[PDB]
Write a protein that binds this ligand. Sequence first.
Ligand SMILES: CCCCCCCC/C=C\CCCCCCCC(=O)O[C@@H](COC(=O)CCCCCCCCCCCCCCC)COP(=O)([O-])OCC[N+](C)(C)C
Ligand SMILES: O=S1(=O)NCN(C2CC2)c2ccc(F)cc21
Lengths: 51, 101, 50
Amino acid sequence: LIDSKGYGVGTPMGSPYRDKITIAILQLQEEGKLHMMKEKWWRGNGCPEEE
Amino acid sequence: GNDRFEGYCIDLLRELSTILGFTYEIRLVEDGKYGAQDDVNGQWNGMVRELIDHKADLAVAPLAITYVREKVIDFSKPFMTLGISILYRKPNGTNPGVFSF
Amino acid sequence: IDHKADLAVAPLAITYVREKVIDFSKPFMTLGISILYRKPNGTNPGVFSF
Ligand SMILES: CCCCCCCC/C=C\CCCCCCCC(=O)O[C@@H](COC(=O)CCCCCCCCCCCCCCC)COP(=O)([O-])OCC[N+](C)(C)C
Ligand SMILES: O=S1(=O)NCN(C2CC2)c2ccc(F)cc21
């Protein structure tokens, strides 16, 4: 990694939905749903060829 | 309708509406960009100006948190950890190593 | 909470139950829970191993 930054759900400046998603993304993360959804879509044909 | 979409970012968006409560309507940006400040007019590009000019409410998308974007829009906290890295072809050749005994 | 000191510059992770009470900023490090266990021994392959 050259740097490190992350994916933010954008809101306009002053949205009350900012904190309601900030708490919500932490709620999917502490439960484990953000790891379920990543390992369902970033899964696939794992490269056999190397072995 | 809003049924033809799938992926990580659309499976996530139904999870946010389940906890918070709303019925989202997905609308693609027609500019096809994400956002960049031009050096000639001081204006913007796709997902960023859709939130600046209030033609949107959220931007649930691969929209990375940079310094110059959060000075105009407000992000949430990250839902995925990336970093810039280099893609290149896997080397398909073998080293000679002609002795090897 | 009871406004005794402004900032909290310390290893104070962003968790669900803390976010509903205090307001963090965005991260400056990235964590992850993992296991700290001992490395195993050495075998010391002797000179008379044949
Ligand atoms: C052990 C079981 C067998 C034992 C048998 C003997 C073993 C011990 C004997 C000799 C040891 C030889 C190894 C040298 C040291 C190894 C590393 C090295 O530098 O070698 C170099 C090669 O060097 C050679 O080419 C080796 C040639 C061996 C000829 C000896 C035959 C004896 C017959 C005599 C008849 C006289 C009798 C008549 C007189 C009365 C390394 O190669 P490189 O070029 O540096 O790099 C690799 C090239 N590459 C980059 C393309 C990949
Ligand atoms: O762009 S951020 O909000 N702030 C910077 N960082 C950490 C410094 C690496 C990170 C690290 C992981 C992220 F998901 C987001 C960010």
